[PDB]
Amino acid sequence: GLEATKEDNLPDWYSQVITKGEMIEYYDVSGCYILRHWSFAIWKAIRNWFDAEITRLGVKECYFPIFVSRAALEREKTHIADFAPEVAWVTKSGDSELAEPIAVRPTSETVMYPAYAKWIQSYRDLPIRLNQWNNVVRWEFKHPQPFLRTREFLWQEGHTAFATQKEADEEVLTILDLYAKVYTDLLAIPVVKGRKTEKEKFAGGDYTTTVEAYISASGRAIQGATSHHLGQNFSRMFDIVYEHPETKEKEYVFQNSWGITTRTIGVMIMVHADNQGLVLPPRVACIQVVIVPCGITATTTDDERRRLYESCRELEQTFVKAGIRCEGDYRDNYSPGWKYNHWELKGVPVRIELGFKDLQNDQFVAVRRDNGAKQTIKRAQATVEMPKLLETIHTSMYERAERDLQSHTKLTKQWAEFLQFLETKNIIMAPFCGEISCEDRIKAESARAMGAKSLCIPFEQPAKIDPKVDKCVHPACGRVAKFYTLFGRSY
Amino acid sequence: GLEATKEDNLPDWYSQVITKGEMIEYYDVSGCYILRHWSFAIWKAIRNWFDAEITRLGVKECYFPIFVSRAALEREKAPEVAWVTKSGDSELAEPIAVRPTSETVMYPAYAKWIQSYRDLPIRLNQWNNVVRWEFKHPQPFLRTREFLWQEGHTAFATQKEADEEVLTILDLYAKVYTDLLAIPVVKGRKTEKEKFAGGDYTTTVEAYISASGRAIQGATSHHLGQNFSRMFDIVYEHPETKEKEYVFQNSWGITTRTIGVMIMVHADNQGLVLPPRVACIQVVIVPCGITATTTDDERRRLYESCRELEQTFVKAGIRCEGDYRDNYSPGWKYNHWELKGVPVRIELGFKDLQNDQFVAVRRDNGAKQTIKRAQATVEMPKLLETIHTSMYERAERDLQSHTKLTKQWAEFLQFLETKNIIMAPFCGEISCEDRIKAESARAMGAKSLCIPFEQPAKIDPKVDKCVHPACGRVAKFYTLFGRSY
Ligand SMILES: Cc1cc(N2CC[C@@](C#N)(C3CC3)C2=O)cc(NC(=O)Cc2ccccc2)n1
Ligand SMILES: Cc1cc(N2CC[C@@](C#N)(C3CC3)C2=O)cc(NC(=O)Cc2ccccc2)n1
Ligand SMILES: O=C(C[C@H]1NCCC[C@@H]1O)Cn1cnc2cc(Br)c(Cl)cc2c1=O
Ligand SMILES: O=C(C[C@H]1NCCC[C@@H]1O)Cn1cnc2cc(Br)c(Cl)cc2c1=O
Ligand SMILES: [Br-]
Ligand SMILES: [Br-]
Ligand SMILES: [Br-]
Ligand SMILES: [Br-]
Ligand SMILES: [Cl-]
Ligand SMILES: [Cl-]
Ligand SMILES: [Cl-]
Ligand SMILES: [Zn+2]
Ligand SMILES: [Zn+2]
Numbered sequence: 001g002l003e004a005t006k007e008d009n010l011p012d013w014y015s016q017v018i019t020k021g022e023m024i025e026y027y028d029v030s031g032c033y034i035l036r037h038w039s040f041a042i043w044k045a046i047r048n049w050f051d052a053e054i055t056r057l058g059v060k061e062c063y064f065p066i067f068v069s070r071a072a073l074e075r076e077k078t079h080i081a082d083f084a085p086e087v088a089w090v091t092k093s094g095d096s097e098l099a100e101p102i103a104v105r106p107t108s109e110t111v112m113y114p115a116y117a118k119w120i121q122s123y124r125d126l127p128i129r130l131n132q133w134n135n136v137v138r139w140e141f142k143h144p145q146p147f148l149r150t151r152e153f154l155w156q157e158g159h160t161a162f163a164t165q166k167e168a169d170e171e172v173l174t175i176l177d178l179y180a181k182v183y184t185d186l187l188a189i190p191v192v193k194g195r196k197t198e199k200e201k202f203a204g205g206d207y208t209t210t211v212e213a214y215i216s217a218s219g220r221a222i223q224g225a226t227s228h229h230l231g232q233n234f235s236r237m238f239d240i241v242y243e244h245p246e247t248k249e250k251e252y253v254f255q256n257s258w259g260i261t262t263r264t265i266g267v268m269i270m271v272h273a274d275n276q277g278l279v280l281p282p283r284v285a286c287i288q289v290v291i292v293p294c295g296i297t298a299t300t301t302d303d304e305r306r307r308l309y310e311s312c313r314e315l316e317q318t319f320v321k322a323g324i325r326c327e328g329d330y331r332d333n334y335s336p337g338w339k340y341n342h343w344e345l346k347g348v349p350v351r352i353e354l355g356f357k358d359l360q361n362d363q364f365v366a367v368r369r370d371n372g373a374k375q376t377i378k379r380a381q382a383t384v385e386m387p388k389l390l391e392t393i394h395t396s397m398y399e400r401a402e403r404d405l406q407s408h409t410k411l412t413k414q415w416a417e418f419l420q421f422l423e424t425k426n427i428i429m430a431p432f433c434g435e436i437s438c439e440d441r442i443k444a445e446s447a448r449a450m451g452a453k454s455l456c457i458p459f460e461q462p463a464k465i466d467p468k469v470d471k472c473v474h475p476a477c478g479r480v481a482k483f484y485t486l487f488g489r490s491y
Numbered sequence: 492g493l494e495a496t497k498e499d500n501l502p503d504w505y506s507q508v509i510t511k512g513e514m515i516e517y518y519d520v521s522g523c524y525i526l527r528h529w530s531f532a533i534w535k536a537i538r539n540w541f542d543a544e545i546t547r548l549g550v551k552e553c554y555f556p557i558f559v560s561r562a563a564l565e566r567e568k569a570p571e572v573a574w575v576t577k578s579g580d581s582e583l584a585e586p587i588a589v590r591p592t593s594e595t596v597m598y599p600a601y602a603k604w605i606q607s608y609r610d611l612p613i614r615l616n617q618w619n620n621v622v623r624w625e626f627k628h629p630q631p632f633l634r635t636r637e638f639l640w641q642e643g644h645t646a647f648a649t650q651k652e653a654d655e656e657v658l659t660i661l662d663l664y665a666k667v668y669t670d671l672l673a674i675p676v677v678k679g680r681k682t683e684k685e686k687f688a689g690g691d692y693t694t695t696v697e698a699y700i701s702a703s704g705r706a707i708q709g710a711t712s713h714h715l716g717q718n719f720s721r722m723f724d725i726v727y728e729h730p731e732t733k734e735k736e737y738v739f740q741n742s743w744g745i746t747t748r749t750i751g752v753m754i755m756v757h758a759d760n761q762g763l764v765l766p767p768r769v770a771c772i773q774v775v776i777v778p779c780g781i782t783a784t785t786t787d788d789e790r791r792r793l794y795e796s797c798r799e800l801e802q803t804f805v806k807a808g809i810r811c812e813g814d815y816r817d818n819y820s821p822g823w824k825y826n827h828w829e830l831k832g833v834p835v836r837i838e839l840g841f842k843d844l845q846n847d848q849f850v851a852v853r854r855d856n857g858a859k860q861t862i863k864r865a866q867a868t869v870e871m872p873k874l875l876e877t878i879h880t881s882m883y884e885r886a887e888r889d890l891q892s893h894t895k896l897t898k899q900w901a902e903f904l905q906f907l908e909t910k911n912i913i914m915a916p917f918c919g920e921i922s923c924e925d926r927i928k929a930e931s932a933r934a935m936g937a938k939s940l941c942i943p944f945e946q947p948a949k950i951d952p953k954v955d956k957c958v959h960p961a962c963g964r965v966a967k968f969y970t971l972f973g974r975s976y
Contacts, residue, residue, distance in 0.1 A: 025600050028563060029587055032556035034600060037615065040553050060528040061535065066557075066589075066620055066637055067520045089577040090589065093624035094570055102520055104575065104589075115516050115525060124818060130528065135557055135620070139578035152556055333609065 001341060005275050006217050014145070017269060021278040021345050024146045031144035031151030035262070038346060039147075041286040042265055043154065046182060047133060050156065050260065053178050059129045059158060064111050066135075067102045072110045076237045088139045104137040109204070109257065112159050113238040116253075123163060123242045126253065131158040147266030148222070148491070155261040161240060161253040165231070168254040172229045175258045176209045179225035182260065187268050188281040188397040189213055190405045191224055192486060194456025199436040205257075206231035212455045214405045215270045215491065219425025221455045222491040224267055225260035271401050272370075278347025279370050281397060282390040289326040289386065290348045291316050291364075294336040295355030304356075311359050315352070315382060322383045324390070344369060349393050350386070370397050411462050411484075415475050418487070422452050427488035429462045431481030433472035442474055442487070455486040492826060496760050501702050505630070508754055511830050512763040515631045522629035522636035526747075529831060530632075532771035533750050534639060537667055538618060541641065541745070544663050550614040550643060555596045557620070558587045563595045567689070568722065573624045589622040594689075594742065597644050598723040605738060608648065608727050613738075614656075616643040632751030633707070633976065640746040646725060646738040650716065653739040657714045660743040661694045664710035667745065672753050673766040673882040674698055675890050676709055677971060679941025684921045690742075691716035697940045697971070700755045701889050704910030706940045707976040709752055712743035756886050757855075763832025764855050766882055767875040774811040774851075774871065775833045776801055777824045780840030789841070790817075797839055800849070800867065807868045809875070829854060834878050835871070855882055896947050896969075900960050903972075907937050912973035914947050915958035916966030923962045927972070930959075940971045 002020060004012040018024040023039035035043065051061070067090065074083060087103040105111065116128055133156050144150050158175065162168045176193060183189040191211035195201075201208035205228040213224045235241065235252035244251045272279040282288050293312045296305050312328050319326035329339050336353075343351055351367040353374075358364050363378045366386070370393055377385050410421045411429040421428050432438075432454070443451040461484050470481040493511060495503040509515040509530075516525035526534065542552070564572070573589040576582060590596060601613055618641050629635050643660065647653045661678060668674040676696040680686075686693035690713040698709045720726070720737040729736050757764040767773055776797045781790060797813045804811035814824050821838075828836055838850040847864045851871070855878055862870050895906040896914045906913045917923075917939070928936035946969050955966040 025603075027556055028560045029556060029558045032558055034556065035554040037551040037553045043554075044552065060532075062528045062531050063526040063534075063639065065518060065520060065523040065525065066622070067523060069519045072519060084579050086579040088575045090573045091576045092574045093626075094572060094574075096626075101577075111518075111525075118516070124816070137557070139575075141578075141581070152558065154554065331609075 002275060002277060002345070006273070010217055011145075013275070014269065017273050017277055018146055021273075021347060023265075023269075023278070029151075031139075033146045033150060035154075038286060039265055042268070042280070042284045043262055045284040046186060046264055047156070049186060050178060050182060051131075051133070053181075054131060054158065054175075057129075057174065059131045059160070061133070062130050063132055063134065064105075064108050064115075066105055068105050068111050069102060070100060072114065073103055075110065086138065086140055088137050105134075106136050106138045107259075108132060108134070108136075108157055108159070109234060113234055113240060116159075116161055117238050117240045120161065120240055120242055120253065123245050126161065126163045126242065127167065128161045129158070130160070131156055145266070147269065148263050150262075153261050153263075155259050157257060157259045160256045161235070162255075163242075163251075163253065165254045168229055168231075168256050172209055172227050172256050172258070175256070176211065176225075176227040179227065179258075179260055180211050182264065183211060183213065183224055183267070184398060186281065186283050187264060188283075188394050188401065189224075189267055189271050190398065190402040192405075192409075192456060192458050193460070194458040194486065196456060197432075197434060197436075197439060197454045197485065199439045200454055202226075202228045202230075204233055205229060206233065210456050212486065213267050213271065214408060214427060214488075215267075216404045216408060216425070217270065218491070219408070219427075219489060220491040221427055221486075221488040222263070222267060222270075223455075224263065225258075227258040228256060230255040230257060272397060273347065276341075277345035279397070280347040280349055282349045282394050285325070285347070285349055287325050287327050287346075287348050288390055289319055289324055289350045289352060290339075290343045291326065291328040291352040291354060292336050292339045292343070293328075293330065293355070294353050295357065296336075300356075308354070308356060308359060312354050315354065315364065315379065318382055319386060322387070324386055349390060368393055370400075409486075413473060415473055418452075418473060419446060422446055422487070422489065423448065427455060427486055428452070429458070429484050429486055430473040431465060431470050432457075432483060432485035433474075433477055433479035434482040434485075435477075435479065438472060438474055438477045438479070441476070445474075450489060452487045453490040455488050455490065457483050457485050493760060493762055493830070497702055497758070502630075504760075505754065508758050508762055509631050512758075513831060514750075514754075514763070520636075522625075524631045524635060526639075529771060530750055533753070533765070533769045534747055536769040536771075537671060537749055538641070540671060541663060541667060542616075542618070544666075545616055545643065545660075548614075548659065550616050550645075552617065553615045554617055554619065555590075555593050555600075557590055559590050559593075559596055560587055561585055563599065564588055566599075566722065567595050571624045571626075573622050590619075591621055591623045592744075593617065593619070593621075593642055593644070594719060598719055598725060601644070601646055601738075602723050602725040605646065605725055605727055608730050611646060611648045611727065611738065612652065613646040614643070615645070616641055630751070632747055632754065635747075638746050638748075640744050642744045643742060645741045646720070647740075648727070648736070648738065650739045653714055653716075653741050656741055657694055657712050657743070660712040660741075661696065661710075664696050664712065664743075664745055667749065668696060668698065668709055668752070669883060671766065671768050672749060672756075673768075673879050673886060674709075674752055674756050675883065675887040677941060677943050678945075679943045679971065681941060682917075682919060682921075682924060682939045682970065684924045685939055687711070687713045687715075689718055690714055691718070695941050698752050698756070699890050699893060699912055699973075700752070700976075701893060701910070702755065703976075704893075704974060705976055706912055706973045707748070707752060708940075709748065710743075710745035713741060715740040715742060757882055758832070761826075762830035764882070765832035765834055767834045767879050770810070770832065770834050772810055772812045772831075772833050773875060774804055774809055774835045774837060775824075775828045776811065776813040776837040776839060776849075777821055777828070778813075778815065778840070779821045779838045780842065781821070793839070793841065793844060796844055800837070800839070800864065803867065804871065807872075809868075809871055834875060853878060855885075894971075898955070898958060900958055903937075903958055904931060907931055907972075907974070912940065912971055913937070914943070914969045914971050916950050916955045917942075917968060917970035917972075918957040918962050918964035919967050919970070920962070920964070923957060923959055923964075926961065927959050935974055937972045938975045940973055940975060942968050942970050 025034035196208040232252045316328040353365040446452040514530035576586045668676045681693040717737045801813045931937040950966040
């Protein structure tokens with residue numbers, strides 16, 4: 001059983017959910033966590049779905065080295081802030097100090113783009129569309145949290161180069177829509193699509209698009225994935241050029257990069273798990289249905305205790321043959337109540353209870369993990385009804401979370417409401433001038449990590465800004481509002 | 492085109508095959524290489540096949556961290572591990588190591604997860620990257636500082652379960668080589684000198700590179716017995732009598748070395764030759780007969796017919812692509828896809844179109860065969876099987892041609908200098924093996940490759956003795972020896 005509640009002590013409840021749910025094992029290297037099989041399976045489902053999508057689009061998979069040279073890391077950088085990256089440095093091999101230290105990759109721009117330059121010998125080599133499924137390392141000295149913010153993490157990073165800007169812009173949005181679908185269609189999590197402000201975009205790119213999710217327990221937002229248009233910034237840095245076929249001049253390609261991580265799993269937990277443990281979205285759950293025989297007594301029999309099991313096994317096999325990931329729990333040394341708790345902790349979407357009674361009556365009881373409701377299904381209907389049920393669960397889980405998100409997304413034009421909404425765990429849609437210094441003042445004034453940050457400029461604007469009358473929300477700015485921006489406390 | 496020959500200058504030829512075959516890009520950190528998509532697709536076929544296999548056996552996938560603490564590493568009881576000592580410009584309180592293998596990462600977790608008898612067995616696998624920072628000469632795919640692999644770690648209540656699993660995994664590795672890669676291998680047990688020092692015995696599959704004349708370990712599957720469980724206190728209490736029991740453990744691994752062996756065995760002086768079951772593209776269609784007088788409607792017509800055939804192949808599960816580029820001649824495309832090793836090239840011109848046929852050319856043979864279009868879906872798979880069989884059988888002939896059996900040291904050395912591997916009676920002593928290696932160099936001394944599961948004859952204890960003239964001992968078994976990588 002869980003020993004903390006999502007409302008009273010979120011970090012404790014989260015630690016208990018990931019350990020008692022057998023997702024994570026803690027490690028003696030801080031900021032790094034063991035992914036047990038139960039959570040790695042969810043990553044597998046996410047990874048395979050996304051890879052199939054981008055493969056169908058024409059991206060191809062490759063693998064570049066974990067180590068980056070110091071020369072490549074520092075390439076073409078001239079400002080002093082650029083020269084002390086927080087990368088992990090390998091300085092020796094056994095007892096031999098190395099000639100030149102080499103860095104663990106925090107991301108792979110620096111080692112892929114020299115190769116892109118070599119590989120693009122003419123305009124006919126374009127586009128180049130590659131992706132890696134790999135592990136990167138960012139050794140920051142802040143508070144790490146499993147899944148959400150770790151020093152080593154698994155991800156995919158796609159790096160694309162095109163002859164025209166139009167191609168690249170289109171791809172930025174196609175990839176962002178895939179990431180949105182990861183959250184909504186696989187994980188039943190609503191997200192907000194938008195552009196980062198100038199303050200929050202990737203500094204090496206032209207613009208950054210994002211999907212943001214909302215953690216109602218803390219009232220905080222978290223960036224779920226990212227999709228950048230780099231424009232020509234890196235092509236000019238790394239001389240990724242080709243000769244124009246018509247004008248014959250040297251032209252720089254247009255690039256994107258895009259990435260998503262195991263943070264997905266963290267968001268799933270933070271949004272869906274409850275005070276009894278995990279609640280797995282049906283489409284990624286390793287096991288969707290567990291069958292628990294019950295009604296066995298001390299004097300049930302032995303020759304009947306096996307009959308009940310036989311019927312449970314028959315139903316299990318039917319489910320598996322219908323494409324439903326199902327298992328039976330026939331362990332004799334654990335009570336049915338124990339098994340109930342154990343599989344609720346692991347968040348299996350449907351528990352089946354099957355007792356002698358219901359065997360007698362051609363039926364069984366299906367129990368939804370997300371809301372606890374029980375339903376009697378005639379065995380003849382198992383194959384028809386159980387898929388429908390799993391779809392319903394996904395939909396309830398999504399719509400539940402969506403209503404949460406919308407009821408805590410508050411539109412206002414008034415600074416006082418901005419502050420009040422922020423202290424009551426909302427995120428806020430407000431007219432915004434877009435300026436970096438104004439964003440700084442908004443953050444500094446809203447602090448009581450408690451200052452509000454911009455989350456994204458949402459593609460779906462809640463209303464149309466009137467450039468003629470609408471001003472920025474902050475009382476001391478006074479500039480024309482360029483758009484509505486989403487603000488909140490950012491995880 | 493390739494500018495070295497496999498039989499004259501093997502390393503230059505190898506480098507030209509992996510670069511012009513678009514497998515590898517060289518890289519400014521020595522001993523690490525970029526895997527382009529053409530080679531990574533091969534690793535992916537191997538990896539997905541092996542994973543489906545062990546998943547059906549009930550092994551489950553997990554992922555452990557790439558960093559190992561110094562204490563953890565030191566529990567194993569000098570090693571060329573890569574040490575992280577700084578983050579940015581802050582020196583770390585304690586240096587952490589890049590995993591060279593995950594025993595010291597995983598087995599503490601195992602000791603914790605095994606709380607009672609009912610938790611056994613534990614059978615976990617990871618697909619990950621490991622680092623071994625050796626200063627010896629590296630070679631792409633074959634010996635690298637960073638490599639991709641899978642490492643499996645299992646724990647059982649009894650030794651016999653574990654012995655069986657060792658053999659099961661070894662058999663899968665053999666199948667990767669023979670069935671996926673068309674490479675014959677010799678299953679065997681390592682000698683006491685060559686086994687993994689931390690286990691009880693090591694099993695292996697050994698392959699032979701005829702060009703080099705050298706043998707190479709293609710995979711490994713260890714029985715660790717109780718060594719590691721005693722080291723890491725991986726215990727349970729026996730349910731009746733409640734004595735403390737140490738679990739029995741195995742580990743097993745295979746790497747991108749597979750791809751290296753593939754090249755070394757099958758590639759030729761025109762480039763790669765991909766075994767059909769791992770080739771990312773199996774069939775490539777090249778449109779032929781386009782003159783400078785070929786009009787644009789006729790070019791559209793030929794391309795659309797090629798694309799129709801291409802998609803008919805893809806729908807029937809044959810991985811086929813068409814090369815519809817107009818800046819490259821048909822002959823250029825022939826050379827290009829030959830360098831890349833695509834098993835079948837289809838040549839489809841206008842005469843072919845009018846006769847409802849095409850020509851399929853085998854990359855391995857060069858042999859051409861005309862096929863009526865209606866029979867495409869039925870003949871093309873057969874051919875692909877034929878290619879696999881040819882490739883395997885060619886390699887197996889080449890391996891048995893280079894496998895020699897003797898009982899006399901003189902013939903043994905004559906064979907070693909003729910680029911052969913030699914089966915000889917052996918006592919199995921470490922000192923004697925050292926002596927055998929020492930008295931064959933003028934590394935080019937003779938090392939033991941494996942004690943083969945399938946012996947060439949019965950080492951009669953009353954008659955047969957060790958092959959070295961200075962060992963007086965009775966021969967325990969026939970051991971396969973040779974020069975190795
Ligand atoms: C698990 C995970 C995820 C992510 N990030 C980043 C943005 C992104 C998004 N969206 C990536 C583009 C895809 C994401 O998920 C980042 C991280 N570690 C870190 O920042 C390093 C760290 C370690 C300890 C404490 C503080 C910081 N750890
Ligand atoms: C690509 C690859 C493979 C393998 N090894 C090992 C044995 C094994 C087998 N069998 C593994 C158990 C599965 C194997 O494949 C090993 C390696 N690097 C190294 O030794 C590091 C190194 C670096 C430069 C020069 C010399 C040595 N690199
Ligand atoms: O990592 C990025 C940009 C993009 N890379 C491709 C996948 C998607 C991803 O958002 C931004 N970023 C983030 N963190 C970093 C940390 C360090 Br340390 C360095 Cl050197 C560089 C970076 C750095 O470039
Ligand atoms: O890595 C092994 C033993 C097995 N681990 C699991 C997968 C299969 C593999 O053969 C042997 N080995 C090989 N090379 C090593 C290099 C270093 Br450096 C260290 Cl510390 C340790 C080792 C080390 O333990
Ligand atoms: Br950034
Ligand atoms: Br990032
Ligand atoms: Br070893
Ligand atoms: Br090894
Ligand atoms: Cl696990
Ligand atoms: Cl590409
Ligand atoms: Cl590539
Ligand atoms: Zn403003
Ligand atoms: Zn001897």
